[PDB]
Ligand binder design. Structure first.
Ligand code: HEC
Length: 405
């Protein structure tokens, strides 16, 4: 539903890439985007798909525009338009130096200190979980593990009840992989009308979970209001329901067709760190944007005031000039170049936890279920969005080859 070409876009910088459904989806989801980095693709194109918008296709320009907030603002960082002008979360839809008050506060509820504390709670779900699993010879990897372990971790951290996950999940997915049952604006209010009551409770009866401390923190030098704490929370509810859980399907995905990464891991327990790093470049997955503040000429291409630019965080690490052999998985990559976690002021607050959670995951999974395969005959589907996704990942193993810890 290609938008017609704004008068100021050259016909020749036009590339019709569809970020919610790109042509080559079946190749996989990092395979479909990589088509942007092909030799017939200008560094910097426009698609008229999802309302017409720019796309930087190369690590250096993604990084660069990620660097330059005065020109490239995260006021509207979502494609489409409606979603971004809709998007208001906090710190994510701010620019320096607003952002910096609120980000520090989103950093109290999830930044390193929190992860250390949560250490054994993270350790004991990951091993509970695989153990309950390993005797069956079988799981849909998505819903058996990729979903319950980070999410339950985040409910634990947010002190939200677990009965609530299926609603919070379905609504958060409607902001990154919309079914088209509902607008973003729609998804988002509905999320807020869940939040808004808990926030109100928690400012009254102030707790030790992410929502009360966020509820009850201060910024700038005065009380955070109920309204900002609400937009403070709806980032969180997203990195916690839905970047981690997908990236997991991603990599078990991977661990499943490749004996030797599995085999190299079990006898390199300290390669796990490097491994996790490399699975971040190789299954990078987020993509969001910026809106131009002004008319601005970037790398010879006239951007105008208000135009949107997709800066796929996912691309940077996939570009053959930041890394030799982009598609090939290697564990001792001498420099894992990426922006999986973002680039700029907005560097993922949730990184340390994601990691944690990837690390333990691989250390526990390989530890008790070393050998496991794609359930057979199945072809694995991915979905494409602001957060790219795995639909379903049936896994199979001989239980004779598992280890109780
Ligand atoms: C507990 C929170 C949490 C977890 C888990 C998490 N994130 Fe984040 N992420 C955040 C928050 C909060 C921000 C906004 C911080 C700021 O504004 O400076 C953010 C920001 C981002 C950005 C910034 C992009 C933009 O608009 O610039 C990217 C990319 C990102 N996260 C990727 C991920 C990836 C990948 C994972 C999965 C492995 C993940 N996040 C897991 C909370 C999370």
């Amino acid at each position: 539903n290609l938008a017609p070409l704004p008068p100021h876009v050259p016909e020749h910088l036009v590339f019709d890439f569809d970020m919610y459904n790109p042509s080559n989806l079946s190749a996989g989801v990092q395979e479909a985007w990589a088509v942007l980095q092909e030799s017939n693709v200008p560094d910097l194109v426009w698609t008229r798909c999802n309302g017409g918008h720019w796309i930087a296709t190369r690590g250096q320009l993604i990084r660069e525009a990620y660097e330059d907030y005065r020109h490239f603002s995260s006021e509207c960082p979502f494609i489409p338009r409606e979603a971004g002008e809709a998007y208001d979360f906090i710190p994510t839809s701010m620019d320096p130096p607003e952002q910096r008050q609120f980000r520090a506060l989103a950093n109290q509820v999830v930044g390193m200190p929190v992860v250390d504390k949560l250490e054994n709670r993270i350790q004991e779900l990951a091993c509970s979980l695989i153990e309950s699993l390993r005797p069956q010879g079988q799981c849909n990897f998505t819903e058996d593990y990729a979903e319950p372990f980070p999410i339950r971790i985040f409910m634990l951290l947010a002190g939200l009840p677990e009965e609530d996950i299926p609603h919070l999940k379905y609504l958060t997915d409607q902001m990154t992989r919309p079914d088209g049952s509902m607008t973003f604006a729609e998804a988002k209010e509905a999320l807020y009308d869940y939040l808004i009551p808990i926030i109100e409770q928690r400012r009254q009866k102030p707790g030790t979970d992410a929502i009360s401390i966020v509820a009850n923190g201060q910024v700038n030098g005065r009380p955070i209001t109920s309204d900002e704490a609400k937009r403070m929370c709806g980032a969180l509810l997203v990195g916690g329901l839905d970047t981690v859980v997908n990236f997991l399907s991603f990599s078990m995905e991977f661990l499943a067709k490749s004996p030797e990464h599995r085999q190299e891991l079990i006898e390199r327990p300290e390669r796990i760190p490097a491994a996790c790093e490399e699975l971040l470049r190789r299954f990078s997955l987020v993509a969001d944007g910026r809106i131009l503040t002004s008319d601005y000429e970037f790398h010879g291409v006239q951007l105008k005031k208000g135009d949107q630019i997709l800066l796929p965080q996912m691309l940077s690490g996939l570009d053959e000039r930041e890394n030799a052999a982009p598609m090939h998985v290697d564990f001792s990559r001498q420099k894992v170049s990426h922006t999986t976690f973002g680039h700029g002021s907005h560097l993922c607050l949730g990184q340390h936890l994601a990691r944690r959670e990837i690390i333990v995951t691989l250390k526990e999974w390989l530890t008790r279920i070393p050998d496991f395969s794609i359930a057979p005959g199945a072809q694995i589907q991915h979905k494409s969005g602001i957060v790219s996704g795995v639909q379903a990942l049936p896994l199979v193993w001989d239980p004779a080859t598992t280890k109780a810890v």
